[PDB]
Write a protein that binds this ligand. Structure first.
Ligand SMILES: [Cl-]
Ligand SMILES: [Cl-]
Ligand SMILES: [Cl-]
Ligand SMILES: [Cl-]
Ligand SMILES: [Cl-]
Ligand SMILES: [Pt+2]
Ligand SMILES: [Pt+2]
Length: 129
């Protein structure tokens, strides 16, 4: 499913991401925009052979099992395919684990390069939340 901006904000808010570990909702929406363009079914393969899945492009080396990433750790305890659902629950639950990890949102390269230090509140402007 491809979310609308305000639709995704609302879903993220419901699932407890607004200010999770100090990161305002705009940060999460901005990350989703540039990671996947709000498309739950996005996948991208990396040169190391791992793959990134879903709206937040969560990586198979560490976080989910795709059956083809040798020495994957599956720290979120889920098949990677679960991350492509139109229900964002699994993505959100796993993102919460990732962002608690030490590096915070710098784990998402597009957040670091495209959202960090910007007016991220613009991403929720106009929405009913
Ligand atoms: Cl919930
Ligand atoms: Cl929940
Ligand atoms: Cl949802
Ligand atoms: Cl929902
Ligand atoms: Cl959730
Ligand atoms: Pt939901
Ligand atoms: Pt939830």
């Amino acid at each position: 499913k491809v979310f609308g901006r305000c639709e995704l904000a609302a879903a993220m808010k419901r699932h407890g991401l607004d200010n999770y570990r100090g990161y305002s909702l705009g940060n999460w929406v901005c990350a989703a925009k540039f990671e996947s363009n709000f498309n739950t079914q996005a996948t991208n393969r990396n040169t190391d052979g791992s793959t990134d899945y879903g709206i937040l492009q969560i990586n198979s080396r560490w976080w989910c099992n795709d059956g083809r990433t040798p020495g994957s750790r599956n720290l979120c305890n889920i098949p990677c395919s679960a991350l492509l659902s139109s229900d964002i629950t699994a993505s959100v639950n796993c993102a919460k684990k990732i962002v608690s990890d030490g590096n915070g949102m710098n784990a998402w390269v597009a957040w670091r390069n495209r959202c960090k230090g910007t007016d991220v509140q613009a991403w929720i402007r106009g929405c009913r939340l």
